[PDB]
Curated annotation (Swiss-Prot), chain B:
<comment type="subunit">
    <text>Homotrimer, with large domains that extend into the periplasm, interacts with AcrA and TolC. AcrA may be required to stably link this protein and TolC. Interacts with AcrZ. Part of the AcrA-AcrB-AcrZ-TolC efflux pump.</text>
</comment>
<comment type="function">
    <text>(Microbial infection) Involved in contact-dependent growth inhibition (CDI), acts downstream of BamA, the receptor for CDI. Its role in CDI is independent of the AcrA-AcrB-TolC efflux pump complex.</text>
</comment>
<comment type="similarity">
    <text>Belongs to the resistance-nodulation-cell division (RND) (TC 2.A.6) family.</text>
</comment>
<comment type="function">
    <text>AcrA-AcrB-AcrZ-TolC is a drug efflux protein complex with broad substrate specificity that uses the proton motive force to export substrates.</text>
</comment>
<protein>
    <recommendedName>
        <fullName>Multidrug efflux pump subunit AcrB</fullName>
    </recommendedName>
</protein>
Length: 50, 50
C-alpha cells in the first residue's frame, strides 16, 4: 500500500509499477550454440595448483 | 553553521545519474550513452556561488 486516497480507493504497488521475478541485472546474456545458456567463468587464484 | 553544512553537502556532490538505453533496453533501441548529473565542486569560486 503506497498511499490511501480520499475516495476509498487503495493505491497498491501492483498498480503503480509492474512487478516480476527478474534479473538483478540485464547486462550479460549467454547463448550456447544459439540455445540460451547461463555460465560459470572460473579464474585461477594466485599460486594455487591448476 | 548547520545550514552551511547542509548547503554544501547539497549543492556539491556527484550523483547516481543512470543511463539512456539502460538494460534491458526496448526492442530495437539503438542509442546508448551515459547520464551526467550534479558534479562535485572545482573552484574556490563555485563555493562562493553557493
Amino acid at each position: 500500500l503506497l498511499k490511501v486516497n480520499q475516495d476509498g480507493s487503495r493505491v497498491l504497488l501492483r498498480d503503480v509499477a509492474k512487478i516480476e521475478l527478474g534479473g538483478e541485472n540485464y547486462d550479460i546474456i549467454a547463448e550456447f550454440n544459439g540455445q540460451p545458456a547461463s555460465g560459470l567463468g572460473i579464474k585461477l587464484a594466485t599460486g594455487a595448483n591448476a | 553553521p548547520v545550514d552551511v553544512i547542509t548547503a554544501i553537502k547539497a549543492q556539491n556532490a556527484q550523483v547516481a545519474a543512470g543511463q539512456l538505453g539502460g538494460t534491458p533496453p526496448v526492442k530495437g533501441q539503438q542509442l546508448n550513452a551515459s547520464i551526467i548529473a550534479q558534479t562535485r565542486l572545482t573552484s574556490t569560486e563555485e563555493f562562493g556561488k553557493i
